[PDB]
C-alpha cells in the first residue's frame, strides 16, 4: 500500500505539443507574447538561475552537498528525542551501570541539621505556593509557567546557604548553554547535542564518588541488552553532523566544570511531556554528554580509562516530580562492551508534593481540602539541597 492518493499528488504536466516532435521546424509559442494564450504552443522555458539566492527566497542545497555531510550516519540525541527503552537504552548507549539511590557521599551532606535551612519547610512551601497558585492573576498557572519558577526558586533557596558554605560563591547557573559530544558504540557513532537549560557551572570539578575498586568492579557487570529493539531506536539518524566535542563555552571561561544540569519538562500537554523513564534517560544522556565533553577537553580526544573520573549531576523535574542523578564518567573507551563502565546513581520519582489544590473543593457547602499543597515531602528537597551542596 502506497501513501498519498493520486488526487492529492502533484498533477502531471500536460502533454507536449506535437509540434515539438517534428525535427526541422521552430514551434510558434506565446513566449514572445509574454503571456499565455490557448491557441499557441506552450514554450519550453529554460530553468531560472537567479532565483534561490536571495536570503528571503533561499533554497538550501541538497543534503549531499552540505559541508558536514558524511556517508557514515551518526545517531544524534537532541532535547526532543524520547528513547523507547528509556533508562536501559541510555545505560547501553553510555556504557553505564545503574545504582538505585543517591550516593552516601552526597546524601550525608544534609544529614547534619546545620545544612538544614532555617524555616526550610516554610520557604519551600512558599515557593510551591507561589509557583502553583500565586504566580499570576490567573487562578491556575500552567506547567510552562510553574516548572521554571519552582526550579529557579528552589535553586535560590539552596543558594541562600552561602552563609554556611562560602564555597558556593564559586558557581553560577548559566542558561541556554549547549554542549555536543560524540563517541562510538560498536561501530555506531552517537552524538548528543544537549541544549536544555540551567547548567550549574562551578570553578572546581566535583570529587569522584566511586573509588578505584568500585570502578574496577564495574568490569564484571554485564551491560543489559534489549532485543529486537536496537539501541539506536528513537535517535535521529543524521548524515549531516559535526564530530567536534563542544563544551558550550569558549576557552578561558570561568566556572568551566559542569556541576548540575537542571532539565525541566515544562510542556503543558502530557503527550508533549516526557515520560518519567524517558526523562531519566535524557538526564543520563545529557550528563554523559557534558561529562564526555569535559573529558575530551581535559584529557584529550583519546579513548581510554580516565585516571580522574568526571562527575556531573542532573536534576530532571516536571515541576512536581523530580529525578536526581549523579553520573561518574570513568572511561572514554566506549566502543567495546567490556571493561570498566561509567556509573550513574539515580533516585527516581521523588515527588516534592503529592498534589496542589488551586481551588478549595467544596462538597455540600463544606470545604473538604483547603487551598495549597497536599502530601508535601521535605525529603525530596533534602536530596535537592544535597545535590546542590555537593562539591562545597
Amino acid at each position: 500500500y502506497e501513501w498519498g492518493v493520486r488526487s492529492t499528488r502533484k498533477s502531471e504536466p500536460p502533454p507536449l505539443d506535437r509540434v515539438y516532435e517534428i525535427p526541422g521546424l521552430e514551434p510558434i509559442t506565446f513566449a514572445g507574447k509574454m503571456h499565455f494564450v490557448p491557441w499557441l504552443a506552450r514554450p519550453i522555458f529554460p530553468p531560472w538561475d537567479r532565483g534561490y539566492k536571495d536570503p528571503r527566497f533561499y533554497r538550501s542545497p541538497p543534503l549531499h552537498e552540505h559541508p558536514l555531510y558524511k556517508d557514515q550516519a551518526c545517531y544524534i540525541f537532541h532535547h526532543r528525542c524520547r528513547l523507547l527503552e528509556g533508562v536501559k537504552q541510555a545505560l547501553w548507549l553510555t556504557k553505564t551501570k545503574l545504582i538505585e539511590g543517591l550516593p552516601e557521599k552526597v546524601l550525608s551532606l544534609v544529614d547534619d541539621p546545620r545544612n538544614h535551612i532555617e524555616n526550610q519547610d516554610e520557604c519551600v512551601l512558599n515557593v510551591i505556593s507561589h509557583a502553583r497558585l500565586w504566580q499570576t492573576t490567573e487562578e491556575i498557572p500552567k506547567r510552562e509557567t510553574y516548572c521554571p519558577v519552582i526550579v529557579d526558586n528552589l535553586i535560590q533557596l539552596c543558594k541562600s546557604q552561602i552563609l554556611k558554605h562560602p564555597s558556593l560563591a564559586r558557581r553560577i547557573c548559566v542558561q541556554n548553554s549547549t554542549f555536543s559530544a560524540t563517541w562510538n558504540r560498536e561501530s555506531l557513532l552517537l552524538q548528543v547535542r544537549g541544549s536544555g537549560g540551567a547548567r550549574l557551572s562551578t570553578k572546581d570539578p566535583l570529587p569522584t564518588i566511586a573509588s578505584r575498586e568500585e570502578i574496577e568492579a564495574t568490569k564484571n557487570h554485564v551491560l543489559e541488552t534489549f532485543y529486537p529493539i536496537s539501541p539506536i531506536i528513537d535517535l535521529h539518524e543524521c548524515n549531516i553532523y559535526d564530530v567536534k566535542n563542544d563544551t558550550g563555552f569558549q576557552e578561558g571561561y570561568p566556572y568551566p566544570y559542569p556541576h548540575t544540569l537542571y532539565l525541566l519538562d515544562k510542556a503543558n500537554l502530557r503527550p508533549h511531556r516526557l515520560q518519567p523513564d524517558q526523562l531519566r534517560a535524557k538526564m543520563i544522556l545529557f550528563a554523559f554528554g557534558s561529562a564526555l565533553a569535559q573529558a575530551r577537553l581535559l584529557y584529550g580526544n583519546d579513548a581510554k580509562v580516565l585516571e580522574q573520573p568526571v562527575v556531573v549531576q542532573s536534576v530532571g523535574t516536571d515541576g512536581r516530580v523530580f529525578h536526581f542523578l549523579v553520573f561518574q564518567l570513568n572511561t572514554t573507551d566506549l566502543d567495546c562492551n567490556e571493561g570498566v563502565k561509567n556509573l550513574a546513581w539515580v533516585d527516581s520519582d521523588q515527588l516534592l508534593y503529592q498534589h496542589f489544590w488551586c481551588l478549595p473543593v467544596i462538597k455540600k457547602r463544606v470545604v473538604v481540602e483547603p487551598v495549597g499543597p497536599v502530601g508535601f515531602k521535605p525529603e525530596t528537597f533534602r536530596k535537592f539541597l544535597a545535590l546542590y551542596l555537593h562539591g562545597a
Binding site: 500500500y1 488526487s7 539518524e237
Partner: protein, 240 residues
C-alpha cells in the same frame, strides 16, 4: 467544490494524522453515502498492513517487540504499536497480543510446517492446514486486505501446489498464492459484537447520522418486482 482528500501524507509515520470527515460527500460536494456526518473528532494512525516489511538495508525474517496495544478510533480492531530494530509501526493486534510480547515476521516457506504461534506472520505456505489466520493478502506483497475487522478469523482450508484455499469470515473460499503472508490467530477486540450502543447519541458520536432520501431516484426506494409474462398476466391479481 474545492475538495482535496485529506489522505495526502506520503511518508509513513507513527504520529496520529488529523483526518477530515467527509459527511458522505464526494469531491463534488454532493452526498454520495447517506447517514454519515459529525461524530467525535478522530486522528488516523497509519497501519502497516504489510507485516513482512524488512527494514531498510535489511532482509530476512525479523522479530518485533509489542510496545503497546491501543484502541483505534478508525477500526473495530485494536491496534498494536510494535518496534523492530530502529523503527516503530502500527499493526493490527491479534486476540491475545500483549505489551512486551514478541512477534515474528518471516518470508521463509519451510519444508515442514512452522509452529503457528498467535500474532506472528508467515507465508501461507508455511502454515499448517486448518490454522486460524487474519490480515490476509490477495497477492504476494500486496498488503493485508482481508480478515481485518475485530474478532475475525479465516481458516487455511487447503494447500495444493503453490496455491492455498482460505475460508474468509463470510465463509467464502479464496485462492491465494502460498507465498502471500498472513498472520496467525483471530483479530483482537473479539467482543466487538457484544457492544450495545444503548442510545442514539452513541451512534451520533460514532459519526452515524439519521438520514432519509437515501435513493435520489424518482419515487425513492422501490423494491424489485417480478414483471409477469403475457400468458401469466391473467393471474397476477385474481380477485377474491
Amino acid at each position: 467544490a474545492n475538495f482535496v482528500s485529506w489522505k495526502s501524507r506520503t511518508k509513513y509515520t507513527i504520529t496520529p494524522v488529523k483526518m477530515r470527515k467527509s459527511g458522505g460527500r464526494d469531491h463534488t460536494g454532493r452526498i454520495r453515502v447517506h447517514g454519515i456526518g459529525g461524530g467525535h473528532k478522530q486522528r488516523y494512525r497509519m497501519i502497516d498492513f504489510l507485516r513482512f516489511r524488512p527494514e531498510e538495508t535489511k532482509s530476512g525474517p525479523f522479530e518485533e517487540k509489542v510496545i503497546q496495544v491501543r484502541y483505534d478510533p478508525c477500526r473495530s480492531a485494536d491496534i498494536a504499536l510494535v518496534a523492530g530494530g530502529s523503527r516503530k509501526r502500527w499493526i493490527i493486534a491479534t486476540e491475545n497480543m500483549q505489551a512486551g510480547d514478541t512477534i515474528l515476521n518471516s518470508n521463509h516457506i519451510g519444508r515442514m510446517a512452522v509452529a503457528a504461534r498467535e500474532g506472528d506472520a508467515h507465508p501461507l505456505g508455511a502454515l499448517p492446514v486448518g490454522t486460524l489466520i487474519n490480515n490476509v493478502e490477495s497477492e504476494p506483497g500486496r498488503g493485508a486486505q482481508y480478515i481485518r475487522a475485530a474478532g475475525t478469523c479465516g481458516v487455511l482450508l487447503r494447500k495444493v501446489n503453490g496455491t492455498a484455499i482460505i475460508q474468509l469470515p463470510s465463509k467464502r473460499q479464496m485462492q491465494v498464492l502460498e507465498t502471500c503472508v498472513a498472520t496467525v490467530g483471530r483479530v483482537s477486540n473479539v467482543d466487538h459484537n457484544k457492544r450495545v450502543i444503548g442510545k442514539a447519541g452513541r451512534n451520533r458520536w460514532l459519526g452515524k447520522r439519521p438520514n432519509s432520501g437515501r435513493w435520489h431516484r424518482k419515487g425513492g426506494w422501490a423494491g424489485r418486482k417480478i414483471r409477469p409474462l403475457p400468458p401469466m398476466k391473467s393471474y397476477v391479481k385474481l380477485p377474491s
